[PDB]
Design a protein around this ligand. Structure first.
Ligand SMILES: Nc1ncnc2c1ncn2[C@@H]1O[C@H](COP(=O)(O)OP(=O)(O)O)[C@@H](O)[C@H]1O
Ligand SMILES: [Mg+2]
Ligand SMILES: [Mg+2]
Ligand SMILES: [Mg+2]
Lengths: 16, 1541
RNA sequence: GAGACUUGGGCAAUGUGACUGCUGAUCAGCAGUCACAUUGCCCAAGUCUCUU
RNA sequence: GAGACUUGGGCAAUGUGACUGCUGAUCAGCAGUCACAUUGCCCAAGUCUCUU
């Protein structure tokens, strides 16, 4: 693997 | 604190229910349960101040951790009126006694401390359990299993089951663990533990207003991908890491103790090998989990911690492995940064580049963490941010912190707002990254967070429980939640309103995470269901519950006084007791545990214990019992182990080894190992090792008697013996001038006075005698003239002549004296000798047959003078005359005869144009009618001196006596004439000064013979010897290669032993008070220096298994003046010392004359009249001439007089008056102080060492029973006295030396002494702080002996090379030359600071700044700018290194050569002005007196201010420094510079 | 050659002050090495009852 | 897999004890020596008595 896989900036602080 | 302490809506009924019975409260954190505990204390505050023995009580506050102990201590101090005891281990509690505990209980009405401290307090029964009114239990959810809470609670059953203390349980979370299913099965465990019901607030809804202080935060969660993708470099480094793991498994470190698994399964690697494996495992775990950029800081952490471990390593084997590990971690860092730099080619915006590389190389989870933080804060105000972040591991915390600083710095939006921090549990990791361990930050991170300095807090599980923190506004749980209690308390750390709880979870593990969280929610909702559904009933009668709960384990043991041993506590006490044994080189101080094999169980206990494990306990090789003890059959290995430990404890106590406290016993004394063999002779004098005197000058001045010399006892001649006559020669030294005509001519005359002896006399050297005209040299005849008393009447006439000589010609007499012929103490005769047949001189019987009664001067009338025949001119030449008309009876010496002069004489300077006849008629014509014989004869006369003690050197000056003196002429018939010749009179004046040197010269000869006989010197120069005359002690104030030392040159050779001159011994005899031209004080210093060196070397050789502290504290008493006094008293020397000033007129008893014998008897044999008779009574014994010159005793009237003298003293104000001061010389007593006697002891030592060398001196020191001989071999030379061991020598072979000696030849290039054994050098350069001290030692033992070596060498050199310097400057010069600062300058000049091995914070730079100061100042010896601290180590390094040089060859000449090569400039610079201490110099000023203020602790430095009246101005100056003794010198340094005006 | 006498100078024996070279005890602060004890946790393996 | 239980590696937290190291302050002991206030001894300069 040359480099990590970037993650999406947006998400949600979903209630648990 | 405040009056707003009114209770909440629940605590009143809470404490009301607590009063009825034991209770446990379950309320969430931040609800003031500590306050309701204080309220309980208030309710139970009835009987506190009363003592326990009178029925009083107290309380006990149980704790969990020392930090929480301090927190609760502050909480109870702020709002209570009682006294609280803060009890924590590792201080006090393990050293306190029952008295201290009881006294603290008397004052302290309540106590706080950790669990085990109270366990030891109660089980050992310092105080009875019933003495506590209530017991307060914090974190009661821990009260299960083998935790100390349960162990303490166990004591209640075995104790008195009446009037028990109350127990209260407090916990934010009731259950610890994951067995949350059927929580009713868990609650009742803690319920029966304290046998009290659980209670919770019923009105939760109404008190949720107060619960708003602990508001439930919102619960959100962040889901991140967990894709299994890893980079290439990780696989590159993993193979090398496992290669290093193998290589470490192949390391060759020294032996290590037994280490294996918990259940005693297969062996485990030693700690020093497995610690690095554990560290690398955790590093790899972090690298895999959090990302490459995380490892980029983790690797720096590994570097900085491996450097610490390398610095702290003792054995050299560990250092190589740690250096290899450090190089490996350096490679890892290099490759990580290589990856970083291979990336980041996209952009040149360094801030944006750093932020983007952090975003990229971060794992998706940490990326989500970063941007969740970014969106949560978004550049809000710093005060709005206050939160806790919880991760799992400590190195995780450190690495997360290290990456967060860089992330924050890479973002301007968070740069000014975020201030992260981290702290962890007990495994205290260094809170720094880029520096070695040198930090001292007293304020812990919790205090920093409480101050508001930090806003974001990273922490491990350390902060989950107990510690009280501000109600933080956020909670981010980076690592997965795994336990119920931790989740409950972490959600309780967002105590404030509007708080946010953020949990980071994996995408592929999100479903199980939400399932687990839901299960935790159900459990937390169901915890209160047991109490809500509980049937309303008490918790009391079920004692069987408690009995079954605690009887499951192993039963305890108890004995008298209530001391109870906890079986679960047996391992700790066994390990502590077995750790007190004297270990071998690698002896093991722990019991060895070995589980028996399968079929050995029946071998010991039978087939009944097939499944029940049995283990043996093996005692150490030095235990009280060398056997082994086996465990009872138990169902598991751990219970078997604890049972074996308990049985071992029981047997050890039943054998009496362990005391009632069960603590291991101690040691009493060590110094008394030698205090019995060295100081045993004090007891017969009333003294002991532990006895000292400090009052009334007791044991400081002691009354002693004197004995006549061995050659004067029984010396009185008798009839029919060969008597020996020694004539006296008086050689004039002064030139023959007009003033010195008579004292020269009449002193060179053949006529002399001699001494008749029945004994022999040695050859006595010439001594000087100072009279008014000058100095006289006196020598005694070597060969006596043999004469025989051929008639009793001849002896009687000689003795009468002696008596009348002393009675009249010198007037040295007293009324109560009696002519002595019976007593033999200093009894002899003096007799003139004249030419009778040839050159040999016989008795001048003409004198003795005439001068039985001296011619009594009387007045002559004109009728008598008319009948008186005309005197011839020869009748007065050389005769003695005196004037009878005058009232003066003083004798007058005839100087010049007048054959050519008439009474009508010529002119004179005063009576110009006057004759002597006219002058005498005018002056004394009242008592002369007329001169009937008025023709052809007058006399020219000169008077003679009256002084007798002709000892003072300068009395004979003539500079101002050179002036004109009158010429005196008398008329003969008016002056009475004596037939005695003034020729003999002039010599007979000097007699008492001759006798009081003959006395002590004979004493000195006796001592010289004794000290030449004991040391078996009977060689050629000691029987046919000729004694050099008396020397003058001028310093008595009465007006490149090396030169080898003369003090030691007479140790390896015998030709250089100079014969011990009798003058040296006589100097050693005479004290200062006698005031002669010679004294003992100069030899004093050398003698004391040799005594110090010998004592230190002897002790350091006999006791090579002792520390220098004990050596010093024993050689103190060995060399103390109290020891020397008693030693020399045992030597019975004091009978031969010269102290008194020789007052002849009053105290010097005549030899052949003494007071009456009956007086001696009844005044010396009677204790009741010992010192009651005073001199006033004695002087009244004016006995008759026949009663004092023939009869020899007192008459009846005189008898009554001197027997009532004491009674009259007892009936007058003379009662109680001292009659011993110079009025007890009749019995020969003398009062001498201790300082004199001790000084003569080492003065004899100095004489012996000077004339006979070091070896003979040390051999003689054996004679004084100070240096006790060894039984195996009596004693050896001062050199070759084999000393050394495990503290004077390095305990490593030659291979390990170079690893501690990086450079040796460079030290050699200056020192000049090629060491043949570098172990001494290494031990000399090893500082105590250096890690090897625990196994090899420190340079302390070497500095102790090098101190004495340098001291004595310098003292001897300054003694021998400077012959006319008093000790006032000798000690000053040596102290200046042995001062620590100049030693430091010597060290830095020769550059020994390079090789010195030490590891300490301040020592690291003190040496560098001092050497920089010296180099800037050009190596200027201070004997100074900005009060720079002197590195006192360097001087101690030289002190130890000189000894190291000495021991390598055991020769002192080589050491002196090296020392001279070292000190050559210093011994040429100091001799000029001998610089003194600057404080001393300031106090030396006449009126500019100093006064120094108190020490000031205003900061890390200290200072003192001084005042001096310079130019009569009340000036004030101040100085700063590290210590008071440093500023004081610098304060004086500024002040003395101020005197430069 | 002595005495009386004054001023000053110098030396030795008691009470205070202070320096040098060894040290010890106590208190406080900081720091290191090592052993052992308790709670809870996941991971891997194994035994038995037990569901399949 | 559940339950009972064991073993091994690992994690977090808590605590006891031993050992020595560094620093600052306080107290006291040992040896050498010096400066300021008390008696005795010897001198410098000068006065008087006594002795020609
Ligand atoms: N009745 C009260 N009177 C005074 N102060 C209170 C009262 N109740 C709570 N407090 C304060 O609220 C804070 C609660 O924190 P803490 O005592 O740690 O809670 P808990 O004791 O429940 O763990 C304490 O600092 C306490 O001073
Ligand atoms: Mg709290
Ligand atoms: Mg002395
Ligand atoms: Mg020293």
């Amino acid at each position: 693997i040359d480099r990590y896989e970037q993650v999406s900036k947006d998400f949600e602080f979903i209630k648990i | 604190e405040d009056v707003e302490i009114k209770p909440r809506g629940y605590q009143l009924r809470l404490v009301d229910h607590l009063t009825k019975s034991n209770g446990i409260v379950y309320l969430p954190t931040g609800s003031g349960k500590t306050f309701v505990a204080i309220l309980v204390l208030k309710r139970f505050s009835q009987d506190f101040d009363k003592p326990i023995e009178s029925g009083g009580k107290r309380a006990l506050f149980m704790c969990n951790t020392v930090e929480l102990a301090r927190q609760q201590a502050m909480a109870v101090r702020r709002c209570t009126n009682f006294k609280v005891g803060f009890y924590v281990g590792e201080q006090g509690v393990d050293d306190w006694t029952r008295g201290m505990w009881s006294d603290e209980i008397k004052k302290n009405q309540v106590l706080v401390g950790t669990a085990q401290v109270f366990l030891d307090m109660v089980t050992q029964t310092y105080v009875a359990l019933s003495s506590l009114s209530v017991v307060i239990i914090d974190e009661c959810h821990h009260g299960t299993g083998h935790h100390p809470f349960r162990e303490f609670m166990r004591l209640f059953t075995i104790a008195n089951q009446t009037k028990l203390p109350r127990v209260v349980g407090l916990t934010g979370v009731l259950i610890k663990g994951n067995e949350i299913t059927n929580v009713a099965t868990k609650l009742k465990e803690l319920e029966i533990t304290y046998r009290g019901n659980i209670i919770t607030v019923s009105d939760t809804k109404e008190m949720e207003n107060v619960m708003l202080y602990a508001t439930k935060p919102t619960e959100v969660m962040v889901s991140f991908p967990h894709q299994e993708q890893v980079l290439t470099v990780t696989r590159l480094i993993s193979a090398e890491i496992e290669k290093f793991y193998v290589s470490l498994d192949l390391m060759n470190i020294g032996v290590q103790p037994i280490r294996r698994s918990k259940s005693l399964q297969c062996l485990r690697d030693p700690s020093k090998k497995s610690f690095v494996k554990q560290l690398f495992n955790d590093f790899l775990y972090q690298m895999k989990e959090y990302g490459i950029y995380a490892a980029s800081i983790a690797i720096i952490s590994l570097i900085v911690e491996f450097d610490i471990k390398r610095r702290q390593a003792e054995t050299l084997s560990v250092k190589l492995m740690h250096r290899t590990a450090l190089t490996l971690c350096e490679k890892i860092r290099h490759l990580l940064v290589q990856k970083l730099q291979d990336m980041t080619y996209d952009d040149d915006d360094d801030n944006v580049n750093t932020e983007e590389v952090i975003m990229n190389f971060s794992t998706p989870k940490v990326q989500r963490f970063l941007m969740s933080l970014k969106v949560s804060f978004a550049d809000k105000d710093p005060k709005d941010i206050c939160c806790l972040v919880f991760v799992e591991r400590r190195y995780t915390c450190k690495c997360i912190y290290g990456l967060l600083l860089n992330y924050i710095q890479s973002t301007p939006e968070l740069r000014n707002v975020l201030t992260p921090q981290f702290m962890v549990g007990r495994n205290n990791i260094s809170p720094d990254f880029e520096s070695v361990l040198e930090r001292k930050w007293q304020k812990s991170a919790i205090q920093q967070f409480r101050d508001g300095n930090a806003n974001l807090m990273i922490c491990s599980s350390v902060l989950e429980e107990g510690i009280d923190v501000q109600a933080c506004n956020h909670v981010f749980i980076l690592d997965p939640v795994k336990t119920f209690n931790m989740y409950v308390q972490s959600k309780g750390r967002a105590r404030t309103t509007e708080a946010k709880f953020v949990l980071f979870t994996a995408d592929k593990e999100r479903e199980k995470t939400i399932q687990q969280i839901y299960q935790y929610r159900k459990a937390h909702n169901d915890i209160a269901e047991y109490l809500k559904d509980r049937v309303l009933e008490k918790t009391e009668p079920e004692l069987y519950e408690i009995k079954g709960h605690f009887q499951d384990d192993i039963d305890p043991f108890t004995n008298e006084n209530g001391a109870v041993l906890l079986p679960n506590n047996a391992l700790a006490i066994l390990h502590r007791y077995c750790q007190t044994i004297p270990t071998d080189a690698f002896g093991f101080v722990i019991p060895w545990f070995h589980v028996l094999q399968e079929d050995e169980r029946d071998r010991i206990f039978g087939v009944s214990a097939k499944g029940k494990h049995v283990i043996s306990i093996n005692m150490p090789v030095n235990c009280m019992l060398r056997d082994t003890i086996y465990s009872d059959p138990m169902d598991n290995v751990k219970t078997a182990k604890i049972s074996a430990a308990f049985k071992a404890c029981k047997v050890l106590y039943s054998l009496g080894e362990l005391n009632e406290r069960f603590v291991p016993k101690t040691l009493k004394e060590r110094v008394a190992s030698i205090a019995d063999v060295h100081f045993e002779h004090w007891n017969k004098y009333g003294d002991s090792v532990t006895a000292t005197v400090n009052k009334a000058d007791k044991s400081k001045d002691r009354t002693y008697k004197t004995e006549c010399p061995l050659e004067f006892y029984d010396a009185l001649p008798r009839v029919g013996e060969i008597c020996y006559a020694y004539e006296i020669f008086l050689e004039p030294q002064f030139e023959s001038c007009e003033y010195t005509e008579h004292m020269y001519l009449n002193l060179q005359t053949p006529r002399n006075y001699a001494i008749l002896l029945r004994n022999k006399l040695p050859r006595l050297a010439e001594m000087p005698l100072f009279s008014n005209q000058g100095k006289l040299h006196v020598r005694v005849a070597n060969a006596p003239l043999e004469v025989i008393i051929q008639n009793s009447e001849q002896l009687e006439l000689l003795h009468q002549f002696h008596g009348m000589v002393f009675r009249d010609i010198l007037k040295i007499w007293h009324p109560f004296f009696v002519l002595d012929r019976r007593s033999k103490e200093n009894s002899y005769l003096v007799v003139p000798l004249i030419l009778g047949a040839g050159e040999q001189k016989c008795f001048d019987w003409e004198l003795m047959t005439n001068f039985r009664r001296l011619p009594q001067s009387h007045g002559s009338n004109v009728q008598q003078r008319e009948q008186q025949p005309a005197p011839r001119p020869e009748d007065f030449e050389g005769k003695i005359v005196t004037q009878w008309y005058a009232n003066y009876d003083k004798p007058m010496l005839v100087t010049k005869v007048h054959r050519e002069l008439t009474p009508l004489s010529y002119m004179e300077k005063n009576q110009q144009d006057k004759t002597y006849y006219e002058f005498t008629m005018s002056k004394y014509g009242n008592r002369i009618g007329d001169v009937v014989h008025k023709d052809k004869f007058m006399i020219e006369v000169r008077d003679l001196t009256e002084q007798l003690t002709f000892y003072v050197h300068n009395r004979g000056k003539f500079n101002a006596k050179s002036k004109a003196k009158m010429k005196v002429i008398l008329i003969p018939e008016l002056c009475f004439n004596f037939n005695f010749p003034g020729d003999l009179w002039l010599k007979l004046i000097f007699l008492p000064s001759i006798l009081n040197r003959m006395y002590f010269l004979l004493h000195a000869e006796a001592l010289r013979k004794r000290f030449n006989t004991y040391l078996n010197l009977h060689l050629l120069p000691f029987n046919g010897t000729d004694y050099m005359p008396r020397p003058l002690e001028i310093d008595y104030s009465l007006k490149g290669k090396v030169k080898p030392l003369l003090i030691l040159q007479k140790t390896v050779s015998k030709e250089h032993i100079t014969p011990a001159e009798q003058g040296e011994f006589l100097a050693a005899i005479t004290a200062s008070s006698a005031a002669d031209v010679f004294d003992m004080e100069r030899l004093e210093i050398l003698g004391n220096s040799f005594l110090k060196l010998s004592a230190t070397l002897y002790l350091a050789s006999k006791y090579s298994d002792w520390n220098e502290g004990t050596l010093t504290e024993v050689k103190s008493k060995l060399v103390s003046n109290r020891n020397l006094l008693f030693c020399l008293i045992d030597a019975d020397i004091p009978k031969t010392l010269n102290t008194i000033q020789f007052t002849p007129r009053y105290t010097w008893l005549p030899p052949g004359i003494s007071l009456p014998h009956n007086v001696l008897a009844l005044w010396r044999e009677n204790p009741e009249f010992a010192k009651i008779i005073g001199p006033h009574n004695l002087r009244d014994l004016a006995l008759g001439d026949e009663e004092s010159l023939v009869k020899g005793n007192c008459s009846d009237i005189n008898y009554n007089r001197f027997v009532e003298g004491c009674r009259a003293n007892g009936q007058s104000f003379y009662a109680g008056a001292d009659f011993s001061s110079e009025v007890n010389f009749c019995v020969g007593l003398v009062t001498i102080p201790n300082k004199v006697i001790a000084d003569t002891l080492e003065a004899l030592l100095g004489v012996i060492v000077k004339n006979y060398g070091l070896q003979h001196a040390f051999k003689m020191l054996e004679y004084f029973k100070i240096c006790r001989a060894d039984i195996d071999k009596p004693l050896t030379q001062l050199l070759n006295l084999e000393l050394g061991g495990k503290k004077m020598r390095a305990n490593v072979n030659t291979t390990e030396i170079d690893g501690f000696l990086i450079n040796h030849y460079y030290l050699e290039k200056n020192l000049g002494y090629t060491f043949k054994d570098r172990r001494y050098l290494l031990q000399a350069l090893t500082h105590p702080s250096y890690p090897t001290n625990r196994i090899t030692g420190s340079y302390q033992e070497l500095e102790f002996i090098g101190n004495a070596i340098l001291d004595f060498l310098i003292s001897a050199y300054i003694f021998e090379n400077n012959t006319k310097m008093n000790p006032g400057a000798l000690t000053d010069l040596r102290s200046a030359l042995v001062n620590n600062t100049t030693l430091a300058c010597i060290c830095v000049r020769h550059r020994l600071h390079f090789f010195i091995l030490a590891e300490n914070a301040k020592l690291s730079e003190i040496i560098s700044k001092f050497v920089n100061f010296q180099e800037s100042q050009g190596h200027r010896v201070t004997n100074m700018s900005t009060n720079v601290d002197v590195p006192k180590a360097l001087g101690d390094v030289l002190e130890a290194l000189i000894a190291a040089v000495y021991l390598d060859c055991r020769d002192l000449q080589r050491t002196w050569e090296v020392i001279f090569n070292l000190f050559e400039p210093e011994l040429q610079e100091f001799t000029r002005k001998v610089p003194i201490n600057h404080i001393r110099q300031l106090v030396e000023h006449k009126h500019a007196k100093p006064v120094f203020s108190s020490p000031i602790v205003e900061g890390e430095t200290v200072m003192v201010s001084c005042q001096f009246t310079c130019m009569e101005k009340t000036i004030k100056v101040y100085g700063f420094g590290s210590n008071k003794d440093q500023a004081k010198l610098s304060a004086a340094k500024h002040a003395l510079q101020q005197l430069s005006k």
